[PDB]
Amino acid sequence: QNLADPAYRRRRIIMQNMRDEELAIAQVEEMQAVSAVLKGKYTMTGEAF
Amino acid sequence: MYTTAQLLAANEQKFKFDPLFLRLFFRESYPFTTEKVYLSQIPGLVNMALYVSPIVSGEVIRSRGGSTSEFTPGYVKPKHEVNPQMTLRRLPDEDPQNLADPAYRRRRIIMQNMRDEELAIAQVEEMQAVSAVLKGKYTMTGEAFDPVEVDMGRSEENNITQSGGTEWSKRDKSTYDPTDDIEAYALNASGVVNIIVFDPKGWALFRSFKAVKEKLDTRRGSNSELETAVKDLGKAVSYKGMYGDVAIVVYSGQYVENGVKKNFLPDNTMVLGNTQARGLRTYGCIQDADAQREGINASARYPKNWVTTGDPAREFTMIQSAPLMLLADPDEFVSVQLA
Amino acid sequence: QREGINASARYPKNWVTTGDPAREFTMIQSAPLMLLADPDEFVSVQLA
Numbered sequence A: 001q002n003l004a005d006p007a008y009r010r011r012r013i014i015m016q017n018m019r020d021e022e023l024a025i026a027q028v029e030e031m032q033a034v035s036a037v038l039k040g041k042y043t044m045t046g047e048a049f
Numbered sequence B: 001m002y003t004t005a006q007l008l009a010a011n012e013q014k015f016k017f018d019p020l021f022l023r024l025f026f027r028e029s030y031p032f033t034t035e036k037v038y039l040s041q042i043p044g045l046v047n048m049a050l051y052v053s054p055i056v057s058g059e060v061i062r063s064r065g066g067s068t069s070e071f072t073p074g075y076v077k078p079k080h081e082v083n084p085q086m087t088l089r090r091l092p093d094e095d096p097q098n099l100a101d102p103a104y105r106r107r108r109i110i111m112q113n114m115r116d117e118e119l120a121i122a123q124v125e126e127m128q129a130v131s132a133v134l135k136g137k138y139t140m141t142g143e144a145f146d147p148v149e150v151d152m153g154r155s156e157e158n159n160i161t162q163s164g165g166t167e168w169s170k171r172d173k174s175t176y177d178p179t180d181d182i183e184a185y186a187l188n189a190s191g192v193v194n195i196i197v198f199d200p201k202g203w204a205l206f207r208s209f210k211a212v213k214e215k216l217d218t219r220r221g222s223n224s225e226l227e228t229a230v231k232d233l234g235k236a237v238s239y240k241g242m243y244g245d246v247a248i249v250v251y252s253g254q255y256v257e258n259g260v261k262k263n264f265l266p267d268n269t270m271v272l273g274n275t276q277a278r279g280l281r282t283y284g285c286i287q288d289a290d291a292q293r294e295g296i297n298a299s300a301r302y303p304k305n306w307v308t309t310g311d312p313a314r315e316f317t318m319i320q321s322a323p324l325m326l327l328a329d330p331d332e333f334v335s336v337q338l339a
Numbered sequence C: 001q002r003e004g005i006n007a008s009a010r011y012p013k014n015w016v017t018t019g020d021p022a023r024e025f026t027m028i029q030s031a032p033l034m035l036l037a038d039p040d041e042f043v044s045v046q047l048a
Helices: A008-039 B104-135 B179-187 B202-208 B224-231 B289-293
Strands: B137-142 B145-151 B237-242 B247-251 B254-256 B261-263 B269-272 B302-308 B314-320 B334-337 C011-016 C024-029
Touching: A008 C011, A008 C024, B104 B137, B104 B254, B104 B269, B104 B314, B179 B334, B224 B237, B224 B247, B289 B302, B289 C011
Parallel strands: none
Antiparallel strands: B137 B145, B237 B247, B254 B261, B269 B334, B302 B314, C011 C024
């Protein structure tokens, strides 16, 4: 009932993207601590690393 | 060596281009903001109220409507080069008795390139307009672009072809009268007709009949049509004059392919049209990443100049748009294919 | 490195690529190195 220009969608996508990137960073920052105080050892391994 | 040669003005060599369609029928242009492009045409047809007396009041009437069509995409972008190493020499302009720095030359060639891109966009638009008011069906296709078909909604009565045994070619050149054919073709026009634009060669056989002699056919016969012809000069349009209630316009516009010229109109066609027939010069949305940053998503044209990094530095210039020429009512014209 | 952000928690960066097909990216950069000063201060019992 109330559309918007195809420009404002770009900023909506941009802020949603920043939110997802921050969430992913905060999520990868937690597995380190979980493994650290769950086993005493940790491994940073994966493709292209 | 020791020459000291001064240069006068240089030629232009503009081959031929006079639209007459983006200036006579498509005077209205509205931009897009959404994916779909609706276009409705209410079927106005009302009955009478013959006799009913104010004692036995009866039947009621019906509301109307029921037409809709969508013509979505459109697109075009003629990118050009900047020639970073061509500015060290001298152009055919810039007379050799007053040179200039190789910086202003870059600005001049950029302006020339932008003008060429604008001309290319205009020539693309005119092909769309010619297909639109020539067949009622358009096809946008080409390399690196999937075909898109726009079915205007034209009926089959407005695509009369002479094919048969009576076209014109085997009639008498001195006694036959083609005005009755004109009336027969113009009866199913859904509007008054006063322009019958011919082809540059389709006008040859039309003048062959002697019935045209009684017609005015003078260089000064009209006011609006003559004024528009003066506007669109360039030796591509020749307004012959009146044919009664209808004017004669010979449109010989040309568009350039990869390297060759081609005619906008086929060999033998005629179009029964209206001077006030409303047509849409509507425009699409620029789906470019850089364009959306400045909020120029909806625009008729979009120039853009940028430069690439690296050891060889090169500039570029581009003009993006999306012409999707349209008509409110396709049935306002009659396309007769002569033979 | 040009703006002296050699040491930071996160780093956002938005950049658009040139060329006829244009696209803009946004990226977050960091280097989490979660460390425990005293490893033996915990006992992880794996229940069954």
